Amino acid sequence: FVNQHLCGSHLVEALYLVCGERGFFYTP
Amino acid sequence: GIVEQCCASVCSLYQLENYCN
Ligand SMILES: Cc1cccc(O)c1
Ligand SMILES: [Cl-]
Ligand SMILES: [Zn+2]
Numbered sequence: 001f002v003n004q005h006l007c008g009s010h011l012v013e014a015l016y017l018v019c020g021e022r023g024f025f026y027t028p
Numbered sequence: 029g030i031v032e033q034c035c036a037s038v039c040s041l042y043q044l045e046n047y048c049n
Binding site for chain 2: 007
């Protein structure tokens, strides 16, 4: 779903911001 | 997953923070 593709792009920028030093894994 | 919680409805940062390391 292209809408999810777009949404996920924003989700990872959000994770980057919130997770900070901790970092994160993105697993769709 | 995060795509299902947070793309069907708008998560908060406290929520998003669950998915961090
Ligand atoms: C910050 C952010 C981006 C995309 C979806 C969300 O629920 C939250
Ligand atoms: Cl978008
Ligand atoms: Zn966008």
